[PDB]
């Protein structure tokens, strides 16, 4: 929505694959310099959870997003 200037309430998770094909059919030159991250679950559910990397990197990152985070 920043490379083609669309309003924010039109592009969401339900039709992301619908409208990215509409952008290369409209401007094939302006769509080439844009980048699109490739990410899907079972790639974030399988990561480096090595020794001393769960209580210190995984739990302490999730505690800072709860309310009353010094208590947890």
């Amino acid at each position: 929505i920043n490379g083609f200037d669309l309003p924010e309430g039109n592009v969401t998770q339900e039709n992301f694959v619908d409208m990215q094909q509409r952008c290369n059919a409209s401007d094939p030159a302006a769509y080439a310099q844009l980048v699109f991250q490739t990410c899907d679950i079972n790639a974030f559910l399988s990561e480096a959870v090595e020794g001393t990397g769960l209580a210190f990197i995984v739990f302490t990152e999730a505690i800072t997003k709860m309310p009353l985070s010094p208590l947890w």
Binding site: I1, N2, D5, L6, P7, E8, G9
Partner: protein, 136 residues
């Protein structure tokens, strides 16, 4: 020579600043809609910021108005370019480096007039800088 022309170049589009506004990110289900009365309030807030910069830094009083802020390329995402002109001299464009210093001086005042928070009111090319943390 080059035979042909480009429809993207303009004689004013090197002293222009791009503004991007994300209303539904800042407020969400409770945000006003951006009609042309909001564009009038934006052009008066920029003219106010140019008045405060020339008074406190350059020691001059210049009567900038909302008709001296020229808006081009209004999109639905809510994005446009603007440049500032001397009050009745239409040929005198204030440089881009002096408008960036004027907006940095009064960015906290422009944000409060629209309830935005420096991530929903972006001046492209101007970045927030300060804020060292500590207390212990």
């Amino acid at each position: 020579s080059f035979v042909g022309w480009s429809t993207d170049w303009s004689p004013y589009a090197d002293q222009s600043i791009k503004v991007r506004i994300s209303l539904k990110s800042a407020l969400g289900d409770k945000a006003y809609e951006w009609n042309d009365n909001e564009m009038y309030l934006f052009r008066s807030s920029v003219a106010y910021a140019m008045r405060q910069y020339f008074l406190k830094v350059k020691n001059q009083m210049i009567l900038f108005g909302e008709e001296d802020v020229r808006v081009a390329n209004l999109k639905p995402r809510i994005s446009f370019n603007f440049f500032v002109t001397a009050p009745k001299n239409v040929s005198d464009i204030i440089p881009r480096t002096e408008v960036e210093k004027a907006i940095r001086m009064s960015r906290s005042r422009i944000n409060d007039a629209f309830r935005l928070n420096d991530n929903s009111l972006e001046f492209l090319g101007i970045q927030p800088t300060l804020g060292p943390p500590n207390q212990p």
